[PDB]
Each structure stands twice: as structure tokens, then as C-alpha cells.
Design a protein around this ligand. Structure first.
Ligand code: M33
Ligand code: M33
Ligand code: M33
Ligand code: M33
Lengths: 288, 287, 287, 288
């Protein structure tokens, strides 16, 4: 065969049962399009999203798409993680078929529902759902490395879905100590040890989660407003951190600041973040 | 003297190229982002000229930042040429990095050609476009630079329909070092890569000639996508097996043989950019 | 609770594998350095056993440190096996990283065989050595590890002449990820690399089978150097052209066909380690 | 041809005029052997050193050897830089032919001439020669990146020769800002910005020179005695530096400490180091 990907029958989807449709957008690393997959699971046609390469794809783009597919299989299913539905890997272009999220990414979702709509309780719920998704990811021995609001999708029923696992790693046995340089990660979401010390652990993902929390409570704001990525390397070393969002309580801001402790072991674990957010969410949810 | 900690930024000064931030007004958008802008005095010290500004986005990675800085550095090394987008200035101190370059009102070549397909491009125009690009590459090669990302999407077109080679973020300076067996090329567009760039960890001017051949095919197909119907996923093996693209409809046998020569498996058997310029000049004259 | 700044070291704890520094006495030397040592209680809690300790040198690089840590991590993943050098313990806290492993009194296989060439090795011994190594690799592959650096110099021999696969610094865990198109392999020994590892940015268990074939050749030549008279400098092109090593003098047609099968260009056409073990067991029994 | 290296006639040496001899040692990345080259320059046979690959050479080893050859051609000739004499690049294994230094590397040279022989003036002279070599290298727009005593050779006439350019880079036009990760450089000779900030400049080589100075004045001592490379990353960030060698004056120790300023622009330039060392050397040299 002229193709290269190995067979994995349980996940393979027939190409003649997939109808590609409207493009959902370009990621410079490939493209996602809406599609109809018959019997992907009932011989019913369900709307899905398909990720594939563009004509100017590089070997890194191809390896990233394949890595994302492999990581999703390892992670497994979870309410707060975009679900892998199947793939077309044989006799043709690589198609990774995933759950379609009609409301788009979290940043645009929040920006479109700003006040002159999102309620404070809705923001806490979003944060809780994502903490649960990350707590699950970490328990599956996966480090995401690219947790941003743009990389979270929202379903028609407003469910938060962590997505974009192309940069994620499997740390079940190897932790890449001193060999993960991290030059392809978004600087404004990176923990200091990821930027300077060639490591990346679950605690580094906790730092990114703190930045994601800030994005949520600013209803889709861009991190470190007015501070170019160009001067952030030295500012971070100097202890500078983002300020408190207007629609954030002291308790939630202290949580963000704790995720940003310089010492990784001083940051909360995702298990602890889930416990605290469950308490806060419950108390902010009307019980009448 | 300078006190310590005056700037938290990192780029060194280069006064001759530095442009005042207060003289630049960023406009509508057009790895990073490019936006139109007005630059006062970059040319008449009071006249505002329309330019393009490349900068980082909020989700910039260290590779993105190093690529933008590398592009700026390569443009200074290469120097000015009619068929290369020219660097006009840069804001590198006390703020975000802005690389200011010539604005090309007609967009990239791919789109340019696609929008001018028969229902306004003439055969002579296609040959002219190809010759201009061969001249730009001959100059770039003489300046000891390998571009590595030559595609029609990376060629811009000005108001006066001048072809401008752009996007030097992946380019390398091979004046003294050639990166033999240490350039893995995983960030280059597969459909434009020579076999030795894909498999053998090298990249020479002859690898750019292979890319030029693909660009020629894109041009004579009026912005068509290379290896139609062939996924990049199976191209690695097809290329080793000797497969090559077919002749575009609006292409003469002479021009197609030129493309095929750029795709010889053995790099030294491909023409040099100097030879391509000489041949295209002759063809253009006889057209 | 723990106060901050108690340790300036970086490795996380793993108690079950940690060995007391005061129970380890470093001896004479044997990327880093390996030295003999005496470890009290690593086995009788009062008995000192002779072991080998791998550690960094004063000119260690971050790659050297990450490689030593990776080797330690891979050995824990792989688990114990008769034909794999076993990990005994490690000192990772409050001091230099010491990876403590089984001491093999007879050195590496290359030297072992060279010192036993006819003026004490028998044909049966060579087959036995090969089978033992096939068994070790079959186990490693079942544990979803790709070694990537299988050479006779990376095989150690114990006092009881047991073959032990060693040097897991370049090994990878492919339980869930296979590194497709992202493993460039520039740090692997060229003369032991499968063509797809050299040219196609992949590495699978079938690539280790190719290396195993080269190891078989090293074994039946009593520690000879692969591709004699052929510089690594011209091997890239020779390999693409289909060239393969000749049959060693002390090798039967059957064993040579096995080597040639490990060197099939198409990876799926090579035997699996499981098949190699089954075939070698039969040959060994008929010898 | 089955080989890959391009021709460069002016430097090519005939293989039949080169006789390989005794091995000078293994560098794990290749091997160096003594040899006789006839007419390499007079049809006289001069003793030279030849660097070549070993049978287990990797692609990095091959690319490093070729890079070293290319860098030496760019640097040019200098009294304090090991001289490239020629190479055999066609129709056979790559041989890079260089000046033979009979006294070996500087670390062993100093250790073999310790006191129960080196004089203090000799140590200052060694340091001055190396500063001159580096001042020249930097003016040629080259960053060495691997300046250690083991990487300095000494000739029969006690001339200091900077060697091992396999990790060096040409920064005539490109400076590799934020794209030089430096994971293959010896940690104990690395400036903090080289370790943490993905950059490498001439000022980073000045830091390494300070460590080399310490090696010289301890007569071949190993840097950061008793401090494992494993804990140096955090100790460096915390401002820790090596102590003053016994046979070092306050003036020379202040020079070392200045080479180790955390801020690169605060370190002296090689031009300044050469000027100060020339003064110190002159004053320590008997003028009777
Ligand atoms: C941030 P980027 O690299 O563009 O990210 P990507 O290219 O994956 O997505 C491009 C567009 O398609 C959207 N998108 C990606 N995956 C899905 C999906 N599964 N369902 C709905 N929209 C998606 C994404 O939010 C964005 O609007
Ligand atoms: C190939 P890519 O990564 O999209 O390239 P880039 O990130 O520079 O995208 C810039 C967009 O604006 C266009 N563009 C880039 N530079 C200029 C310029 N100097 N003048 C006019 N248009 C430009 C370019 O063709 C594309 O449409
Ligand atoms: C192939 P290399 O990089 O030399 O490999 P290494 O750096 O481990 O060198 C170690 C030296 O001591 C030998 N050696 C390594 N490990 C052991 C061991 N566990 N027992 C006995 N000898 C060993 C090894 O064969 C070589 O001679
Ligand atoms: C530190 P390493 O990697 O072994 O360094 P290398 O392998 O280049 O050198 C190995 C041995 O050969 C010595 N050597 C290298 N080059 C020369 C030379 N040009 N003249 C004399 N000895 C040399 C070097 O000092 C050491 O003793």
C-alpha cells in the first residue's frame, strides 16, 4: 500500500459512510469540517467534526494529527473531554472523527455571551467542569500542555469539552525530565518550569488551568493584557501575575494565584481544585 | 550609562532599522498575524505610507517568536531586490516586535491566479511571473540563503503586478555552514519538498530548485493544488518510486521539461537558478 | 509537612527503588561513567554485593542527565528478565543520580567474542547467545518498548555467560504513542539502523528486528564490525540501493537467511521477535 | 558517487599521502589518531592529528564532524586556535586533518605540572593566550559553546590552542534568538541564559571563559567541587558561584566573578579581558 498508518479495526470508519460538509475553520496545522457519519454510533446519520490535513501539511502537522488520535484513544471517554468517534486511516487521507460541538470554542462562546448571557454561576460551572476534565486527564497519566480557552469546545447543551490533544504526552512511564523543551507551547499559559527548566508535569497543567480560570472570569479576555509575550519571560521570573477579574471573588482569585505559585508542589492538584470548585458551585447554585 | 532593569524586553538594538512606535498606526488584519498599517516618515518624513506589519498573537509560542525574529534577520542579510518583499523597518525596543514590510495590494499568488482564471491571465503573463520568481530566487541563492518554504501562497503580488518572494521564517543562512545531516525539515510543506529534504537530512539550493518546479506547476495551473487527488499521506512512498506531476493544460512541452528537470532525483542534475533565469528569459523573449 | 528549599535537587521520590547512599561504596571505573561498587543490603541486609553504578561526569549535558533518568525510568517499565541487565536500585535524592544495576563480570559482547576467537567459542555457543538475545528482545517488545540502540557493545555478559541486553538511554515507551513521523533518529548508530528509521521518521519493533539482524552478524563474525570496509558516509545510499552484508564464515545458510529476512526492506516482511525465538529454539535444539 | 560531501579542492588532501598511526583517544563522538601527511604544508612529512568517525557513528556524530570542519574554515587561522590543515572528503571516510598538539588537553597538561612545573606567571600566560583566541573567535562572529579546559590543546612549545568546534555556531547574520535550546552543552560551563532562556551570545562564551579561568588557576580542577550538576540549576538561579582558587589573586578572582554576572551585558567583553590580562601578565613577567 502507498499509505503508512497501521490498521486499528475497532476505530476504523468506512469512507463511503462519511459525507464531508462545511469547513469549521483552519488551524494552520490542518482543518476541521462538519460531516455526516452513517452508523458511526444505530444506522442513523449523526453530525460529527472531522480533522484532516491541508495541502501544505508538514511532517510535524501529520505527526501532530496522528498523535492527537492516539492520545484520545489512551485518555478514554469522559463527559468533559471531546470524544473520539472513529477514524479513516486506510487507503486515503487521514480523517480523525470527533464529537461535534455546536457552540464553538470557549473564548468565542464567552465573548458572545457578555453583558452590555453568562451568569456568575455559569462561569463557576464552566470552571468546575474543566477541573473535572483535567482531573480525569491527569489520572489517565496525560499532560495536555496546551490548555487554553480556544482549546475548549462547548456543546449545544453547554457542556465544556477539553480538546486539541496534538501537543499532549503520555507520562504513564516516562516523564521527559530535562528533555521537554516546550518551544511549541503558548507562552502566556506556560508555567515557569515549562519555560525555563525543560520539564512538564501535571502541576504545569495546573498553572495553565489558572490562566484558563482567568480567561473564564474575564468572559474570554486575553491573558496579561497590555503585556507582550516578548517581555513576559523576565516579568514571570520577577514574580508578576495577572490581576483579579472584575467578576471574580477573592476566593476564586486566591485559587488562581495558588495555581500560579512559582514552586510546582505548592500549587493545588486537580483533585483539590475539583473539591473546592464543587463546594463553591453548590453554594452559588440556587437551591429554592 | 544605562541603569539595569530599564527594559524587560530581550531583543538587541539595531538603530538603522528601528522605526518609532508613535509614527505607526496599526489597521485591519490581513504563527502570527499580519495587519495593514500607516507608517509616517518610513519613506517625505511627513508622508504616511501604507505598509504591512507582522507581529505575534496572544497565543505565541517560543518557536513563533524565534521565527519572526529569524525572518527579520534573514531579510536584512538578503538585502533589497525587485522580486523579494522588502523590509522597511522594525519596532524591537520597549514593546512588541513589529516587523514592517512592503504592502502587496494584490495578495498571495495562489489567490491572485485563482481569481484570474478563464470564465484574465494570459500565457505571456504566466511566463513573466515565473521569470520574475526565478530572478528573485537566483538573487536569494547568490546571497547564500536557502528559503525552504517556496510556495505560491508565499509569493505576494503588488499593485503593479510584481511578484515578491515572501515568508522567510524558515530560511537559513548557509554562507559558512550547510547543516549537512542536521536539518531534518519536519516543518516544511511536504508537497513542495525535494526527496533529499524529506529523507536525507540535507537542504541545498538544489532543494529550493525542486520547490521552484512545484511553484511553476502551481503557476501554469492558475493556482492549482499540487499532486491533485494524492494525499500527503501517501506521497512519501510515491516520490521514492519516481512519481511526478503531469503537465498543466496551459503549459508548453518546453516549460514542462523545465519542471521535470527541477524534479530530477539527483540534485546536481537539476538546473541552477542561474540556468533557469537564462532559459526563462529566452522563452519570455520568444513569447 | 515539608518546608520549602530543603533540597536543591530535582528528581521526584520513588521509595521502593531508593537505595541508601551510606550503604554504597564506589569503586574503580569500568554520556557518563560506570563504576564498580559495593552495595550493602541491596539483596542478606548485611551482605555487600558487587554492582555497577551509572552516573554523570563533571561535563554532563542536559541530554546526558535526561538520558540517564530515561534509562532508569525505562528499566522500571520493562521489568525483570533473564536476558536484560536488571535495575537494582537508585540514589536520586539529596545527591548525584546513581543508577545501580547488575554487574556483568565478562564485559560487553563485542569484546567477549573477540577475546574468544580461534587462535574458545563453539558454534553451539554462538547460537545460544543469539537465542538468549532473541528472548530478551521478545520480552522487551511485549513490554511495548523499542530499544533503538541494539548492538553487541550494548549487550553485557555475566560470569555464568548469560547475555544481558543493556543501555536503555535511547529506548522509548510505545504503549500508547508510536511517534509516527516525529522520531528523527539522529542519535542512533547508523550501521544498525533500518532504512525506515534512517529515512522515514518512524521506529517500530520491526526496526529493532533489523538491528537484531546486524547483531546476529556481529555474533557469527565473533565480534566483527558491520559493513566491513564500508564507511558510514556512503552507507545511506548503499542501503537504499539494496546492499546487504555477506554471510559470516561460521554461519549456516539457515542462519544467514534469518539475517537477510531481518533486513527485508518492507518492515512487515521481517520476522517478529516471537518468530525469531521460535526459529532459534528449533535451531538450537538441532545443534 | 556513493558518498555525500561536496568538493572543496583547496582543502582536499590526497588519501595516498596520509599515513594513519597511533590513536590519540576516543571522544565517544569519533576518534582522533596521529598521522603523517606528505606535502600537506614542502614535500616533507609533517605529523598531524586526524579526526574521523567510529563504526557506531550516529547522524549527529557525522553532522558534528562536518560542522567542525566548516567552522574551522570560517574562523581562519590564529595562533591560539587549533589549525585546520586539510581534509579527505571524497571517495572514502571523512578525515579532518588538524595541527597535532603534543602536550594534550589543558586539563591533563596542568594536572601533570602541579606542585608536590607551572609557575603563577605561566597560569596568567595561559589565560591571556586563551582570551586572545576567544577575542579573535568572537570577532569572526563565531560562538564556541563548548569552551572547557578539556577542549583546549597545548603544543610542544606550550602554545594554547582552542579546539573542538563541533558545537560552535556562525552568528554572522542569524543569532538563533529563542531557538537555541543548548541541551548538548556541558552544564557546569553554561551561562544562566544559555541554560534557561534559549539564547547564546558571545557574552555566554565569556561566562564559560570565567569557568575556564577557574580551571586554570586550580591547575586542572573540576568546577563546582562537591556540587553535582543535578543541583546546579537551582543553585545558579540563587546566585551561587565558585570560590577563589588558592593560587589566584583578588584581581583575577574579581575577573572571574565579573564573567559570572547574571546579566550578560554586565560581563566584560573578550576585548576587555585581553586588555586586562595583558596588563596583569606584563606586571607578573620578570623584566630583569
Ligand atoms: C485554534 P485552531 O488551531 O483553529 O483550532 P482548530 O483548527 O482545531 O479549530 C478551528 C475552528 O474549528 C472549531 N472546531 C474544532 N473542533 C471542533 C469540533 N469538534 N466541533 C466544533 N467545532 C470545532 C474550532 O473551535 C475553531 O472554531
Ligand atoms: C502562509 P500564512 O502563514 O498565512 O502566511 P501569513 O501568516 O503571513 O498570512 C498573512 C496573510 O496576509 C497576506 N499577507 C502577508 N504579508 C503581506 C504583505 N506584505 N502584503 C499584503 N498581504 C500580505 C498573506 O498572503 C496571507 O493572506
Ligand atoms: C557503549 P558506551 O557508551 O561505552 O557504554 P557505557 O557508557 O555504559 O560504557 C560502560 C563501560 O563499562 C561496561 N559496562 C557498562 N555497564 C556494565 C555493567 N553493568 N557491568 C559490567 N560492565 C559494564 C561497558 O561495556 C563499557 O565497557
Ligand atoms: C574530550 P573528547 O571528546 O575525547 O575529545 P577528543 O575525542 O576530540 O580527543 C580525544 C583525545 O585526543 C586528544 N586530541 C584531540 N585532538 C588532538 C590534537 N589535534 N592533537 C593532539 N591531541 C588531540 C584529546 O585531547 C584527547 O586526549
Amino acid at each position: 500500500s502507498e499509505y503508512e498508518l497501521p490498521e486499528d479495526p475497532k476505530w476504523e470508519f468506512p469512507r463511503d459512510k462519511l459525507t464531508l460538509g462545511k469547513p469549521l475553520g483552519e488551524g494552520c496545522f490542518g482543518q476541521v469540517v462538519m460531516a455526516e457519519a452513517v452508523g458511526i454510533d444505530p444506522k442513523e446519520a449523526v453530525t460529527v467534526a472531522v480533522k484532516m490535513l491541508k495541502d501544505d501539511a508538514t511532517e510535524k502537522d501529520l505527526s501532530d494529527l496522528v498523535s492527537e488520535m492516539e492520545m484520545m484513544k489512551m485518555i478514554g471517554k469522559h463527559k468533559n473531554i471531546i470524544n473520539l468517534l472513529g477514524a479513516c486511516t486506510q487507503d486515503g487521507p487521514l480523517y480523525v472523527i470527533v464529537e461535534y460541538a455546536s457552540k464553538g470554542n470557549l473564548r468565542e462562546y464567552l465573548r458572545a455571551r457578555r453583558p452590555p448571557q453568562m451568569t456568575f454561576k455559569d462561569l463557576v460551572s464552566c470552571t468546575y467542569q474543566l477541573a473535572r476534565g483535567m482531573e480525569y486527564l491527569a489520572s489517565q497519566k496525560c499532560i495536555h500542555r496546551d490548555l487554553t480557552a480556544r482549546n475548549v469546545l462547548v456543546t449545544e447543551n453547554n457542556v465544556m469539552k477539553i480538546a486539541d490533544f496534538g501537543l499532549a504526552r503520555d507520562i504513564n512511564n516516562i516523564d521527559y525530565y530535562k528533555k521537554t523543551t516546550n518551544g511549541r507551547l503558548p507562552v502566556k499559559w506556560m508555567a515557569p518550569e515549562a519555560l525555563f527548566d525543560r520539564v512538564y508535569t501535571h502541576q504545569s497543567d495546573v498553572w495553565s488551568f489558572g490562566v484558563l480560570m482567568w480567561e473564564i472570569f474575564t468572559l474570554g479576555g486575553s491573558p496579561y493584557p497590555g503585556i507582550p509575550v516578548e517581555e513576559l519571560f523576565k516579568l514571570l521570573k520577577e514574580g508578576h501575575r495577572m490581576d483579579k477579574p472584575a467578576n471574580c471573588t477573592n476566593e476564586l482569585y486566591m485559587m488562581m494565584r495558588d495555581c500560579w505559585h512559582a514552586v510546582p508542589s505548592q500549587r493545588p492538584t486537580f483533585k483539590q481544585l475539583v473539591e473546592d470548585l464543587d463546594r463553591i458551585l453548590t453554594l452559588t447554585t440556587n437551591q429554592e
